[PDB]
Amino acid sequence: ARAPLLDYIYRVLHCCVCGSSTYTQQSHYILTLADLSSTDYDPFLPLAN
């Protein structure tokens, strides 16, 4: 099911308060960068260091 945005916000906050590890469901528990990709948004644009 399509979880609401506040759900992901609280998931990320819980991960921050508890720890980055110990959460490897890797399905929907944490929103990842690749999820942001859409028709007019590339989350991996080239950059020069």
Partner 1 sequence: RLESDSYSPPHVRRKQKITDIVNKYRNKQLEPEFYTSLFQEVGLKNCS
Interaction site with partner 1 (CB under 8 A): 4, 6-7, 10-11, 13-14
Nearer to partner 1, 10 or 43 (CB): 10
Which residues in the chain belong to E strands, given as ranges?
Answer: none
Nearer to partner 1, 13 or 36 (CB): 13
Task: Compute the CA torsion angle 42, 26, 30, 10 (nearest 10 deg).
Answer: 160
Q: How far apart are CA 5 and CA 30, in angstroms?
A: 11
Nearer to partner 1, 5 or 45 (CB): 5
Beta carbon of residue 19, minimum distance to partner 1 (angstroms, whole number): 13
